């Protein structure tokens, strides 16, 4: 009866706050993770390019 | 919702002005009727926008024609000057 | 001119009735409580359905019975030969409910 | 009653609303996160690429 | 919602799978699988489901539902099995129903389905399809779906339409394959569903799909060759559903934030030309909404359209069009600033542009350009009476007097306005 009139609001508010906070912390971790994975691929390129330096020599 | 309130107000004022204009035009109304013909679109807003533009150029031509008769008074003065020798 | 006259009249009237509502905190459905004759509520239901067809948005537009202690207003169904006497009797005031 | 069934079908209607707009905003927020990830990764990988170019 | 009611009535009854516990007709070994971890709510069961690795999930159930020809029970069995796929927050994550031994089970098994849109085959196939956009797998052959009738059948015509439309909304997530399918003729199919009249929800999800496409600047350049934005403004005008407006506002924001080249991205002015949406934005300004994103977006729209009008506020483009005879309803023609200040620029050497307009009066009979020229001359004389004297030397007053009798009545009134401007001190 009158009880749905606040349950509507509470469910919507939870569904909004949870995903907003999720995105904030996700970006916070993801910036760092992007740096480290980029560096990992970078050093892999270093290794294989040392290999074709040797082949070229 | 006072935004809807005072836009209702300004359409009212514009309609009052054109009503005064028509009273000066002494053109009677006919009252065709068909009382239920009020629809529910947002097109009413730009329709009355077109109408307020319309009587804006009515005001423009009003000032133009009164200034034009102002000039024409000196024009008649000039032709009277031409008449005398 | 006259059609737009009556149009704008109806517009300000309905906007005034919209002011006469309860804006929920954010619920997109307005909530109101209106006296309705017990002999026309089905006509009101038909009007609500008409609102549904004339604005197709799968909107229910529900009207529900509820009871209160507040005093209802009094109404009289007059006609051509009964309206003048109703004006005469009501010029002196209005009595309690079901008088 | 008739009004009782109206109340119950209202309950399912507002649950349907809740899930609709809630899923909507969820995808909105997730998408925004995706583009911010894309731009940040682009910046950092660009700096790494530059340093690679000078070394090579 | 067909799918919602179908799932609800599915949840009201459980199949007697135990009768075929070791029957190859129905789940000789998968019955023991579904017996295990019946408490699917428990996260311990979630993280121990990977112990199977998919040797039964999506490896024994696969090519076994087709074996069960009895539709009445296999529908319930498959949907109960893939209810896990239905919720699937991260319980799949990186394809926990792995079955790495053969990749035929994982990606390309969708081909036999996409048929029988009534025993839930097509909806289940769509759900299986929708497991790579935001998941740890990728379909090698994008043409095996992009030219398939699982979306060409729903392009016409009906809850299934918006159900598969939502699945397609889930599809458009990453530019790599979005661009690939945009290079196909499916763009024209999107245009076709734009043109036909259908439900408001279908249009809504379609504008959301346009939002999904908006993320790629090069795709925006590709689609710039169409008149989609006029259609966007039209649908904004005709309907107001308080989220379609949000999506359209965000779409314009993303269009004009991804402006790789403003010189070719003329939408900033073309949207204005094909529809004066700024009045709609002003109207939306008056209403306060609980979403601050809307206020930020409308502010961004207002300011960027402001410097759009500033970009269109120039004198050299007007002169270039004057030489070419193109006399439209340009913003400079309605620009009060232009007439107030840059009218001195129109005092050229020999007034060649004004002379060209004078020639256009007697050669061009087009009502529109004549109205533009008449108003321009009227403003020019309004801001430079000696120019009016030069016009009277050229005899242009009698020329406009000839033009008052043109077959286009509004052109007669425009020439009348120009004449009225000519009558100061005259």
Q: What is the 3-class SS of chain B, one letter each residue? A: CHHHHHHHHHHHHHHHHHHHHHHHHCCCCCCCCCCCCCCCCCHHHHHHHHHHHHHHHHHHHHHHHHHHHHHHHHHHHHHHHHHCC
Question: By the 8 A CB rule, do C57 and B39 touch?
Answer: no
Question: By the 8 A CB rule, do E216 and E256 touch?
Answer: no
- Selecting from B1, B9, B15 the residue whose C-beta is nearest the C-beta of C18 gives B1
Which residue carries 């969708």 as its tokens?
E110
How far is it, in rounded angstroms, from Cα E391 to Cα E380? 10
Tokens representing E59 are 């490896």
Note whether E219 contacts D: Cβ–Cβ < 8 A: no
Subunits adjacent to chain A (3 or more Cβ pairs under 8 Å): C, D
∠ CA E214-E220-E221, nearest 5°, is 170
Q: Of E287, E182, E198, E270, nearest to E235 (Cα)?
A: E198
- D24/E243 Cβ within 8 A: yes
Q: Of E387, E385, E419, nearest to E400 (Cα)?
A: E419
Buried b (16+ CB within 10 A) or exposed e, C85-96: eeeeeeeeeeee
Phi, psi of C60 (to 5 degrees): -75, -45
- D34/E173 Cβ within 8 A: yes
Note whether E288 contacts B: Cβ–Cβ < 8 A: no
- Selecting from D11, D33, D56 the residue whose C-beta is nearest the C-beta of A23 gives D33
Question: By the 8 A CB rule, do E403 and E361 touch?
Answer: yes
How far is it, in rounded angstroms, from Cα E340 to Cα E161? 56
- Which region holds residue C79: left if phi is over 0, alpha if psi is between -120 and 50, else beta? beta
Number of Cβ atoms within 10 Å of the Cβ of E220: 20
Note whether C57 contacts E: Cβ–Cβ < 8 A: yes
Residue ranges in chain C assigned as alpha helix (H): 2-19, 41-54, 83-90
Tokens representing E397 are 């007053």
Instruction: Choose from D23, D26, D28, D42 for mutation: most chain E CBs within 10 A.
Output: D28
Q: Which residues of E touch B54 (CB under 8 A)?
A: none
- B51/C4 Cβ within 8 A: yes
Answer positive or negative: Cα dihedral of E110, E112, E115, E119: negative
Note whether C26 contacts E: Cβ–Cβ < 8 A: yes
How far is it, in rounded angstroms, from Cα E331 to Cα E313? 7
Chain B residue with minimal CA distance to C23? B1
Answer positive or negative: Cα dihedral of E201, C15, C26, C61: negative
- B35/C4 Cβ within 8 A: no
- E26 has which bridge partners? E23
Phi, psi of B18 (to 5 degrees): -70, -30
Residue ranges in D1-56 assigned as alpha helix (H): 2-55
How far is it, in rounded angstroms, from Cα E335 to Cα E326? 17
Distance from CA of E288 to the nearest CA of C (A): 12
Q: What is the largest CA-CA distance in chain B?
A: 71
Question: By the 8 A CB rule, do B11 and B50 touch?
Answer: no
How far is it, in rounded angstroms, from Cα A19 to Cα D33? 10
Question: By the 8 A CB rule, do E31 and E76 touch?
Answer: no
Distance from CA of E165 to the nearest CA of B (A): 29
- Selecting from D3, D9, D17 the residue whose C-beta is nearest the C-beta of C64 gives D3
Phi, psi of B53 (to 5 degrees): -55, -45
Note whether E258 contacts D: Cβ–Cβ < 8 A: no
Residues 6+ apart with CB under 8 A from E357: E322, E373, E376, E377
Q: What is the largest CA-CA distance in chain A?
A: 83
Contacts across the C-D interface (CB distance below 8 Å): 12
Q: Of E103, E109, E51, nearest to E78 (Cα)?
A: E109
* Per-residue 3-state assignment (H helix, E strand, C coil) for chain E: CHHHHHHHHHHCCCCCHHHHCCECCECCCHHHHHHCCCCCCCHHHHHHHHHCCCCCCCCCCCCCCCCCCCHHHHHHHHHHHCHHHHHCCCCCCCCCCCCCCCCCCCCHHHCCCCCCCCCCHHHHHHHHHCCCCCCCCCCCCCHHHHCCHHHHCCCCCCHHHHHHHHHHHHHCCCHHHHHHHHCCCHHHHHHHHHHCCCCHHHHHHHHHHHHHHCCCHHHHHHHCCCCHHHHHHHHHHHCCCCCHHHHHHHHHHHHHHCCCCCCCCCHHHHHHHHCCCHHHHHHHHCCCCCCHHHHHHHHHHHHHHHHHHHHHCCCHHHHHHHHHCCCCCCCCCCCHHHHHHHHHCCCCHHHHHHHHHHHHHHHCCCHHHHHHHHHHHHHHHHCCHHHHHHHHHHCHHHHHHHHCCCCCHHHHHHHHHHHHHHCCCC
Q: Give the Å distances, CA to CA, from E119 to E79, E114, E183.
A: 11, 11, 33
**E368 CB-side CA count, 13 A:** 6
- Which region holds residue B41: left if phi is over 0, alpha if psi is between -120 and 50, else beta? beta
- C31 has which bridge partners? C22
Distance from CA of C12 to the nearest CA of A (A): 30
Q: Of E281, E385, E375, E294, nearest to E332 (Cα)?
A: E375
∠ CA D35-D39-D44, nearest 5°, is 145
Buried b (16+ CB within 10 A) or exposed e, D1-21: eeeeeeeeebeebbeeebeeb
- D10/C60 Cβ within 8 A: yes
Q: Which residues of B touch E287 (CB under 8 A)?
A: 3
How far is it, in rounded angstroms, from Cα D17 to Cα C58? 11
Note whether B56 contacts E: Cβ–Cβ < 8 A: no
- Selecting from A8, A15, A19 the residue whose C-beta is nearest the C-beta of D14 gives A8
How far is it, in rounded angstroms, from Cα E119 to Cα E309? 57
| DSSP classification of residue C31 | B
Which residue carries 């919507």 as its tokens?
A12
How far is it, in rounded angstroms, from Cα E322 to Cα E373? 9
How far is it, in rounded angstroms, from Cα E374 to Cα E391? 12
Subunits adjacent to chain E (3 or more Cβ pairs under 8 Å): B, C, D
Question: By the 8 A CB rule, do C32 and C21 touch?
Answer: yes
Tokens representing E375 are 């108003």
Q: Of A6, A9, D1, nearest to C64 (Cα)?
A: D1
Instruction: Choose from A25, A30, A33, A41 for mutation: most chain D CBs within 10 A.
Output: A30
Note whether A16 contacts D: Cβ–Cβ < 8 A: yes
Q: Give the Å distances, CA to CA, from A14 to A6, C57, D21, E88, E401.
A: 12, 26, 12, 20, 72
Chain A residue with minimal CA distance to D12? A4
- E279/B64 Cβ within 8 A: no
Q: Which residues of C touch E242 (CB under 8 A)?
A: 28
Residues 6+ apart with CB under 8 A from A20: D29
Q: Which residues of C touch B36 (CB under 8 A)?
A: none
Chain C residue with minimal CA distance to D4? C64
How far is it, in rounded angstroms, from Cα C71 to Cα C69? 6
Determined by which method? cryo-EM
Which residue carries 């609980």 as its tokens?
E290
């Amino acid at each position: 009866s009158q009880t749905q009139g606040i349950q509507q609001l509470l469910q919507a508010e939870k569904r909004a706050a949870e995903k907003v906070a999720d995105a904030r912390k996700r970006k916070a971790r993801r910036l760092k993770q992007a740096k480290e994975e980029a560096q990992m691929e970078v050093e892999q390129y270093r290794r294989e390019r040392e290999q074709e330096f040797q082949s070229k020599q | 919702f006072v935004n809807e309130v005072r836009r209702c107000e300004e359409m009212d004022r514009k309609l009052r002005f054109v009503e005064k204009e028509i009273r000066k035009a002494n053109i009677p109304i006919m009252d065709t009727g068909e009382n239920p013909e009020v629809p529910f679109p947002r097109d009413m807003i730009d329709l009355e926008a077109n109408f307020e533009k319309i009587e804006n150029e009515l005001k423009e031509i009003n000032t133009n024609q009164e200034a034009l008769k102002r000039n024409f008074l000196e024009l008649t003065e000039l032709k009277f000057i031409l008449r005398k020798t | 001119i006259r059609v737009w006259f009556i149009k704008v009249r109806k517009m300000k009237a309905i906007y005034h009735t919209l002011n006469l509502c309860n804006i929920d905190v954010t619920q997109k459905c307005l909530i109101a409580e209106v006296w309705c004759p017990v002999t026309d509520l089905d006509s009101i239901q038909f009007a609500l359905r008409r609102g549904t067809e004339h604005s197709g948005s799968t909107v229910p537009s529900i009207l529900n019975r509820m009871q209160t202690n507040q005093t209802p207003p009094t109404y009289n169904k007059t006609n051509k030969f009964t309206h003048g006497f109703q004006n005469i009797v009501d010029a002196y005031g209005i009595g309690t409910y079901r008088e | 009653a008739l009004s009782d069934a109206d109340v119950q079908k209202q309950i399912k209607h507002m649950m349907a609303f809740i899930e609709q707009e809630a899923n909507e905003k969820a995808e909105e927020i997730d998408a925004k996160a995706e583009e911010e990830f894309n731009i940040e990764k682009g910046r950092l990988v660009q700096t790494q690429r530059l340093k690679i170019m000078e070394y090579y | 919602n067909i799918i919602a009611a179908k799932a609800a009535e599915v949840r009201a009854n459980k199949v007697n799978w135990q009768s075929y516990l070791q029957g190859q007709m129905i789940s000789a070994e998968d019955c023991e699988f579904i017996q295990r971890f019946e408490m699917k709510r428990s996260s311990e069961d979630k993280q121990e489901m990977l112990q199977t690795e998919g040797s039964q999930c999506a490896k024994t159930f696969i090519n076994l539902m087709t074996h069960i020809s009895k539709e009445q029970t296999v529908q319930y069995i498959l949907t109960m099995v893939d209810d896990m796929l239905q919720e699937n927050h991260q319980r799949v994550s990186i394809f926990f129903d792995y079955a790495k031994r053969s990749k035929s089970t994982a990606w390309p098994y969708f081909l036999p389905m996409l048929n029988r849109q009534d025993p839930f085959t097509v909806h289940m196939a769509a759900r299986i399809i929708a497991k790579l956009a935001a998941w740890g797998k990728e379909l090698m052959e994008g043409s095996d779906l992009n030219y398939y009738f699982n979306w060409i059948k729903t392009q016409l015509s009906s809850q299934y339409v918006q159900c598969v439309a939502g699945c397609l909304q889930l599809m458009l997530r990453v530019n790599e394959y979005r661009f690939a399918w945009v290079e196909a003729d499916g763009v024209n199919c999107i245009m076709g569903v734009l043109s036909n009249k259908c439900g408001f929800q279908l249009q809504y999800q379609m504008i959301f799909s346009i939002w999904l496409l908006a993320f790629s600047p090069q795709m925006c350049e590709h689609l710039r060759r169409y008149n989609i934005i006029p259609v966007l403004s039209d649908i904004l005008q005709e309907s107001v559903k308080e989220k379609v407006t949000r999506i359209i506002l965000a779409a314009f924001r993303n269009f004009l934030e991804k402006s790789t080249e403003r010189e070719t991205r003329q939408e900033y002015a073309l949207a204005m030309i094909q529809c004066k949406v700024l009045k709609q934005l002003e109207n939306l300004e008056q209403q306060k909404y609980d979403d601050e994103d809307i206020s930020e977006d409308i502010k961004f729209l207002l300011e960027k359209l402001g410097e759009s009008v500033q970009d269109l506020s120039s004198f050299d483009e007007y002169s270039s069009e004057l030489k070419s005879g193109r006399l439209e309803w340009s913003p400079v023609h309605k620009s009060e600033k232009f007439w107030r200040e840059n009218a001195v620029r129109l005092n050229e050497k020999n007034y060649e542009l004004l002379k060209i307009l004078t020639k256009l009066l007697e050669v061009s009979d087009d009502p529109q350009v004549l109205a533009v020229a008449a108003h321009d001359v009227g403003e020019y004389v309004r801001h430079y009476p000696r120019g009016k004297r030069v016009i009277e030397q050229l005899g242009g007053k009698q020329l406009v007097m000839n033009h008052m009798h043109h077959e286009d009545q509004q052109v007669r009134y425009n020439a009348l306005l120009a004449v009225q401007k000519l009558m100061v001190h005259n």
